[PDB]
Write a protein that binds this ligand. Structure first.
Ligand SMILES: CS(=O)(=O)c1ccc(-c2cnc(NCc3cccc4c3CCO4)n3cnnc23)cc1
Ligand SMILES: [Ca+2]
Ligand SMILES: [Ca+2]
Length: 350
């Protein structure tokens, strides 16, 4: 990788999220979204390190602080869609062509920390909140499918979540130091997803009833000793981090335990390895994998970017000294974008 370009957004506020649109065809524009303050900004990556500003979305609320974004597509037209959320705890669906808000979702009792779209179903949106819960929405029928939380749910703010390869299960993590598994391929969840597609408030005066999922399918507090702020699946394995200068690779149960044979009472975990680094001991620092899950990247609090080959290189620039909150690889992994606390954007080309 080589740093080919850098820019700074006019608002001067930290950038907390960045996502390349992985739903674009080869030979079509390489587009990424950034989120900071009450702004959502789209950019195009061109040859010779060129970054072109496409459009900006400024939220009506000046007090809104976007923390996360996620791309999807309209299942009927294949047109891209962008979901954004933050401090207001409102999910906003943006048309990226016009950069206008199509619709919004209200429900969480507090800020939304992360948004994730189901890897098979482009209409299933997962939100994680400061209210200790996770919510699964069907954005085609504007329905709340399920709420993951309560008695055995997270006991503090949820910071991150990730669907596995097929979207059969979710792993969530947060301020209570725990990592919790939620199976969504259960007869109950599959039926709830099916029913959410049959719902239309214009053909019934009755509200759609959300599944109240009080119990996870696995839980551990034995990986990290502080806020778990990022979780990703690596096949049947888990990559997770706290502010303890390490990304831990682990799995539920004993070494040979199949993840789909794990019972909710499972008291064991197996640590398979760690990715060690420095000066990334502050809260709210995201690691990211490329589409192929062959590359791993994490920015640190003083502008250094760590990249590991999953099959360590430290990317540095003398002008990049602010905390790197999130990174995003282009679909082909040829480009790596880093976003910072000083509203700066950094482009690294392979
Ligand atoms: C400059 S400052 O004033 O010190 C500051 C620093 C961080 C935050 C902040 C950031 N992000 C989130 N949530 C999303 C989140 C969750 C897990 C990992 C992660 C992210 C974004 C990057 O990595 N926050 C929720 N409440 N506050 C925050 C706000 C102000
Ligand atoms: Ca399995
Ligand atoms: Ca299986």
């Amino acid at each position: 990788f080589k740093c080919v370009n850098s820019l700074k957004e006019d608002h001067n506020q930290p950038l907390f999220g960045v996502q390349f649109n992985w739903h674009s065809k080869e030979g079509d524009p390489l587009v990424f979204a950034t989120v900071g303050s009450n702004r959502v900004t789209l950019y195009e990556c061109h040859s010779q390190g060129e970054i072109r500003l496409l459009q900006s979305y400024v939220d009506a609320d000046a007090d809104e602080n976007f923390y996360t974004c996620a791309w999807t597509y309209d299942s009927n037209t294949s047109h891209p869609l962008l979901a954004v959320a933050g401090s207001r705890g409102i999910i906003r669906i943006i048309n990226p062509i016009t950069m206008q808000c199509i619709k919004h979702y209200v429900g969480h009792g507090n800020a939304i920390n992360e948004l994730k779209f189901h890897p098979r179903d482009p209409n299933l949106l997962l939100s994680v909140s400061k209210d200790h819960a996770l919510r699964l929405w069907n954005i085609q029928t504007d329905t709340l499918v399920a709420i993951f939380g309560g008695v055995e749910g997270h006991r503090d703010e949820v910071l991150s979540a990730d669907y596995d390869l097929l979207g059969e299960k979710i792993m969530s993590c947060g301020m209570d130091h725990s990592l919790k598994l939620w199976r969504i391929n259960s007869k109950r969840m599959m039926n709830a997803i099916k029913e959410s597609y049959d719902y239309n408030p214009n053909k019934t005066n009755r509200p759609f009833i959300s599944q109240k999922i009080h119990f996870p399918d696995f839980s551990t507090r034995d990986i990290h000793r502080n806020y778990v702020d990022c979780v990703r699946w690596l096949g049947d394995l888990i990559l997770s981090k706290s502010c303890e200068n390490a990304i831990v690779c682990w799995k539920p149960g004993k070494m040979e335990d199949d993840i789909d044979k794990i019972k909710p009472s499972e008291s064991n975990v197996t640590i398979l390895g760690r990715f060690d680094y420095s000066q990334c001991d502050i809260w709210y620092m995201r690691f990211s994998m490329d589409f192929w899950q062959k590359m791993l990247a994490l920015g640190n609090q003083v502008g250094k970017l760590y990249v590991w080959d999953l099959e360590c290189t430290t990317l540095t620039h003398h002008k990049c000294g602010a905390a790197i909150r999130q990174t995003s690889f282009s679909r082909d992994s040829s480009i790596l974008i880093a976003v910072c606390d000083d509203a700066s954007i950094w482009r690294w080309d392979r």
